[model samples]
Target chain A: SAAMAEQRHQEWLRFVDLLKNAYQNDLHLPLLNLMLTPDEREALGTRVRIVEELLRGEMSQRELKNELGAGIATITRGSNSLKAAPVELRQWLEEVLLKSD
Target chain B: SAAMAEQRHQEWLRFVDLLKNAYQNDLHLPLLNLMLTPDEREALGTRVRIVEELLRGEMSQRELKNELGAGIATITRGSNSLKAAPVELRQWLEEVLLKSD
Candidate 1:
């Protein structure tokens, strides 16, 4: 029911506050940049570029993979993320960039 | 010469690509949205909203803390993150949202 959904929303909202409190109080959670192999470092750069392009909505994943020399599998993950992103974030992206196909 | 800067930039770019490779190949990194205590959960939601608004750039950090009832420290972390985010991303956010104060 709508009432249940509203209650869940409220619950989630409260949960977020608590999460921030822990993160604020705990300094140890700061992510340390761990070691990366040469190959893995290359892949990370590729993925960030892929994500950048994906957010732009400029090309199909296949096209991007070919153009950017990105792995098809890695590109697919970014494609999935775009599909799953919050509607608000999606709208904001659309407003910022040229439209998708 | 500009050579060293360019080389460093190129090095970082390759490293990023490598980082993505590890993340894409590894299944364990899906970031299990783990359990949170009541207060921690609440903070997570608060921080998410704070990020949303920070990217929007409507208010100063002090103003946001006052308005959202967010801790000064938590808001400061977010402020620092904004300062550190990629210039490209900052531009994208500015393009999407109303200009910051």
Candidate 2:
């Protein structure tokens, strides 16, 4: 049984490498730009703070609208994305969210 | 100041009590935790696997003494809490280091 477990471990290792290979080669893989630029980090931080406020559920929709402003369509898309995002992304987000909690 | 440029818009929507208090009084710190759950939808399929490996490199003989399995040593594991475990755990013995690498 221990031997079998070791085999599975090796299998998983190979698979991640296969992915690393594909990602390394793929034209669209973000790893090509894996490092988030400073501006991107700022934007992410801003989003985190803004979203943190939203999580409190303290503001009215109108208040949220005002706070977010005319480009409230980001909220529109967010509502959609939150409701319908891929499992991989959602799972990773869940991992992060749980840590924050 | 554009209303002090309220928090950025993120869709986690977790905080609930402070909102009632804010509407009742004036305001407070916005606290929250975003949510992500399963059967979610991302365009990219999840690989969901991993492995582990280690270098026989220049770790000092003093460190290699653990190989004796005498089990008598001061382990200098960074005392960071599990909450702070560099995200590089078990990828080895669990799911990390033990990989075929």
**lDDT (10s digit) by residue, model 2, range A48-93:** 4344434455766567668655236545544454445445444443
List, in the given order, the native-contact fraction of each candidate.
0.19, 0.00
Report the TM-score for the A-chain of model 2.
0.37
Model 1 DockQ reads 0.10
Per-candidate DockQ values are: 0.10, 0.03
Q: Number of clashes in model 2?
A: 22
lDDT per prediction?
0.50, 0.32
lDDT of 1 by residue, B1-101 (tens): 25455643574554333323333433112211211123443454566557667877788888898887888877777667667655655564454333521
**Per-residue C-alpha lDDT of model 2 across residues B44-93, encoded as one tens digit per residue:** 01112111111223444344445422112211221112223333332232
- Measured against the true structure, the TM-scores of the candidates, in listed sequence, are 0.32, 0.26
The 10-residue segment of model 1 chain A with minimum total lDDT is: A27-36
